[PDB]
Amino acid sequence: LTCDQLPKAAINPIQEFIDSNPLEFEYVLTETFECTTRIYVQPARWSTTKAPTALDIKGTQIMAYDFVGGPENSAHLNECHTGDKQVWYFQYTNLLTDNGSSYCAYRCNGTEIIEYKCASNNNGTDPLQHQAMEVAKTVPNGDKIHYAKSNCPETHGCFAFY
Amino acid sequence: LTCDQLPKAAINPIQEFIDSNPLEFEYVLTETFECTTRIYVQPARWSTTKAPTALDIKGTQIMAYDFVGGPENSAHLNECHTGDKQVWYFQYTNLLTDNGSSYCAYRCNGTEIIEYKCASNNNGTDPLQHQAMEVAKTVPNGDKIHYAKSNCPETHGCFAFY
Ligand SMILES: *[C@@H]1O[C@H](CO)[C@@H](O)[C@H](O)[C@H]1NC(C)=O
Ligand SMILES: *[C@@H]1O[C@H](CO)[C@@H](O)[C@H](O)[C@H]1NC(C)=O
Ligand SMILES: *[C@@H]1O[C@H](CO)[C@@H](O)[C@H](O)[C@H]1NC(C)=O
Ligand SMILES: *[C@@H]1O[C@H](CO)[C@@H](O)[C@H](O)[C@H]1NC(C)=O
């Protein structure tokens, strides 16, 4: 199985993601997204693209990406500080269940996987999440995929921020 | 007029703030909140306080505060990185109108004002906002209040983030 053959699941309407906020990453590929909270935001009233935004928040640092849909259930992200473009897909989504929300998303470079973001608001207890992680680690470079919350800084009174 | 005599307006339900996202600051007191976007977030499923969160995002830096209601329409903020507490009030709110949303919030130290955050998603065109700003600048230390968006970094394809 190669990265290009992973499922490209249908992307739920943006409000379902917004209604899932806040989410935390459970499994990621590089260290960049360890100990990270994800927030979805509707487009600004003054946005001329009317693209929503994904926020990756790690302590006091934040990466933001406006995004729009592309071919084959892709999400085309525009990293807001650089203008750098990224193409993402979802392995699966399972939003707004009785046990909350989870999803796993990935970024390929051809047959190899180069980034992975499994998110939840239920501390990784959706059986679909563990299962997707086990499939993703079988694609080339999937060996890098690992638990995102092993060594996170202590909190100071909040729950999704530190 | 002193800071303690400013209006303490009723705080709209949290969903009305969330539905206003993203907002930008129009008038602030210190430089800290210039060129800043505000995002409201519902409490995490795993939060034991069930406090929502306000996010102040300035480029790639973020301050987060969990908050709960206090006496006399106060908002009691817990800055998530330090545990430092702040007591805020709203001068007025005007959320989810035909011309979008605006509000002005302030933080006193007794009779003096020490921080001010007027937010909107309509580029400061709510007449209530200019009017509130003119009142706030008359309390002691209100002379510091000024336009928040005079020298902001260039964007790279997004609208509420840079
Ligand atoms: C994809 O692979 C090649 C290296 O083999 C590299 O030149 C290119 O920048 C890579 N792209 C990304 C987005 O990592
Ligand atoms: C979240 O899940 C991990 C196991 O993956 C567990 O060790 C940890 O204590 C759980 N956290 C909470 C808040 O229950
Ligand atoms: C309020 O005023 C005094 C200085 O006159 C200072 O000691 C105290 O820390 C101030 N509090 C805040 C929150 O600024
Ligand atoms: C926002 O308002 C200011 C005046 O306060 C104006 O100079 C600026 O061009 C406006 N921005 C947009 C995007 O219309």
Cβ distance A161 to B122 less than 8 Å, yes or no, reads no
For every residue of B27-47, DSSP letters joined together read: EESSGGGTT-EEEEEPPPTT-
The span from the CA of B88 to the CA of B139, in Å, is: 16
The span from the CA of B162 to the CA of B156, in Å, is: 6
The pair phi, psi for residue B18, each rounded to 5°, is -60, -45
- Residues A39/A1, Cβ–Cβ less than 8 Å: no
- Identify the residue whose tokens are 């302590």: A59
At A68 the three-state DSSP class reads strand
Closest C-alpha to B90, from B20, B7, B23: B7
The span from the CA of B123 to the CA of B112, in Å, is: 27
Task: Select from A106, A109, A112 the residue to mutate for testing ligand 1; criterion: most ligand atoms less than 8 Å from CB.
Answer: A109
> Is B109 a pocket residue for ligand 3 (Cβ < 6 Å)?
yes
Whether the link from the prior residue into A43 is cis, omega within 30° of 0, is: no
The span from the CA of A160 to the CA of B49, in Å, is: 12
Pocket of ligand 4 (CB under 6 A): A 46; B 123-124
The token pair that represents A101 in the structure block: 């929300």
CB-based contacts of B7-10 (< 8 A; 24+ apart in sequence): B7/B89, B7/B90, B7/B91, B7/B92, B8/B72, B8/B73, B8/B74, B8/B89, B8/B90, B9/B73, B9/B89, B9/B90, B9/B91, B9/B92, B9/B93, B10/B73, B10/B90, B10/B93
Q: 3-state SS of chain A: helix, strand, coil percent to 5?
A: 15, 40, 45
**What number of other Cβ atoms are within 10 A of residue A31's Cβ?**
11
The span from the CA of B61 to the CA of A44, in Å, is: 19
For every residue of A86-155, DSSP letters joined together read: EEEEEEEEEEEETTEEEEEEEEEETTEEEEEEEEESSTT--HHHHHHHHHHTTSTTGGG-EES-SSPPPP
At A81 the three-state DSSP class reads coil
Task: Calculate how close chain A gets to B76, using CA atoms only, in Å.
Answer: 12
* Ligand 3 midpoint to CA B109 (Å): 6
Which residues are CB-contacts of B40 (< 8 A; sequence separation ≥ 6)? Answer: B14, B17, B18, B20, B21, B52, B53, B54, B55
- Identify the residue whose tokens are 């519902």: B42
> Is B87 a pocket residue for ligand 3 (Cβ < 6 Å)?
no
**Cα–chain center distance at A140:** 19
At A29 the three-state DSSP class reads coil
DSSP state for residue A44 in the 8-state scheme: P
Method by which this entry was solved: X-ray
At A69 the three-state DSSP class reads strand
**Cα–chain center distance at A10:** 14
Resolution in A: 2.0
For every residue of chain B, DSSP letters joined together read: --GGGS--PPPPPHHHHHTT-SEEEEEESSGGGTT-EEEEEPPPTT-SS---EEEEEETTEEEEEEEEE-GGG-EEEEETTT--EEEEEEEEEEEEETTEEEEEEEEEETTEEEEEEEEESSTT--HHHHHHHHHHTTSTTGGG-EES-SSPPPPSS-SS--
- Identify the residue whose tokens are 């935001």: A41
The span from the CA of B162 to the CA of B155, in Å, is: 5
